[PDB]
Amino acid sequence: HHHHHMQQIQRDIAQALQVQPPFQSEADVQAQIARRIAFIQQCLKDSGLKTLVLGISGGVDSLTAGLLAQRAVEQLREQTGDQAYRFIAVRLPYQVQQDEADAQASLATIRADEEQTVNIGPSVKALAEQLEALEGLEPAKSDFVIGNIKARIRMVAQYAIAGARGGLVIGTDHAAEAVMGFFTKFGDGACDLAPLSGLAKHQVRALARALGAPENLVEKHGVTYAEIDAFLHGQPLREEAARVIVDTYHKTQHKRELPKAP
């Protein structure tokens, strides 16, 4: 009884997230790259816009989305002859050594048409200073609230560049991130198009490898991504992990919906 219902729950979650079936062949992998590149191009055409904007953090998700974006605009320039098609990669520096090294290495992999650097530090600090509600907060809560300010001002910076340059903002959400609600609402969850949607984490890595990323970048709630992916694909995993994934999914549903309305 319990098993049958948990099975139905897993299947309904995978359908809601449009989970991509596991890749069975190279044909599958190449088809997904082609589809997502075509999706990116179709978003530009439908919007009548020419520019793509994406923060490059150094992580594999933005590396993969960045590679798809750069290939998409290269193809559009070739086919249309319109040199205004451009991908703008955005560096949003912080103070994690490995991240910044990974970010530079990521940029070197993408070879984006254009790179811009936005230090959000001054803006985050200047907002913080005006929020009396931050005064007296316990340190763990303060760091969390300030962390989400940072994530949201990174969104604001990308949208400002897109507005300046007539662009769409790319987000890096995929099914392994989405099922756990592992993003800031109206921060990195906020974009115009999410070309990695539905992918399991190992599928994101598979695309990055097929797109030419170096191996060190490809492999760069108490639950692992291997567990999350097994859950998404309906494969065996520890019952306790399935429980945490389902409970987390339910708690975070509001992050995957529009604002509530009566």
HSE value, Cβ hemisphere, 13 Å, CA-based, for 151: 17
Q: What is the DSSP letter of 133?
A: G
Find out whether 121 is annotated in a ligand binding site: no
Task: Please state, in angstroms and rounded to a whole number, the distance separating the CA atoms of residues 150 and 143.
Answer: 10
Of 172, 168, 151, 44, nearest in space to 106 by CA: 172
Find out whether 113 is annotated in a ligand binding site: no
Whether residue 200 contacts residue 175, with contact meaning beta carbons closer than 8 Å, is answered with yes
DSSP 3-state of 138: coil
Task: Please state, in angstroms and rounded to a whole number, the distance separating the CA atoms of residues 21 and 36.
Answer: 15
Find out whether 77 is annotated in a ligand binding site: no
- Residue 143 neighbours by CB distance under 10 Å: 11
Find out whether 55 is annotated in a ligand binding site: yes
Find out whether 161 is annotated in a ligand binding site: no
Q: Which of 12, 26, 46, 61 is catalytic?
A: 61
Find out whether 82 is annotated in a ligand binding site: no
Q: Which of 102, 173, 177, 188 is catalytic?
A: 177
Per-residue DSSP letters for 225-246? HHHHHHHHHT----HHHHHHHH
Active site residue 61: yes
Find out whether 123 is annotated in a ligand binding site: no
Find out whether 119 is annotated in a ligand binding site: no
Active site residue 138: no
Tokens of 203: 């599928």
Whether residue 35 contacts residue 27, with contact meaning beta carbons closer than 8 Å, is answered with no
Find out whether 177 is annotated in a ligand binding site: yes
Find out whether 148 is annotated in a ligand binding site: yes
DSSP H helical ranges for the chain: 2-16, 26-47, 60-80, 97-110, 121-128, 139-165, 175-178, 201-210, 215-218, 225-233, 239-251
Cα distance between the two ends of the chain: 35
Find out whether 62 is annotated in a ligand binding site: yes
Point out the residues that are catalytic: 61, 177
Binding-site members for ATP are 55-62, 172, 201
Binding-site members are 55-62, 148, 152, 172, 177, 185, 192, 201, 254-255
Binding-site members for deamido-NAD(+) are 148, 152, 185, 192, 254-255
Binding-site members for Mg(2+) are 61, 177
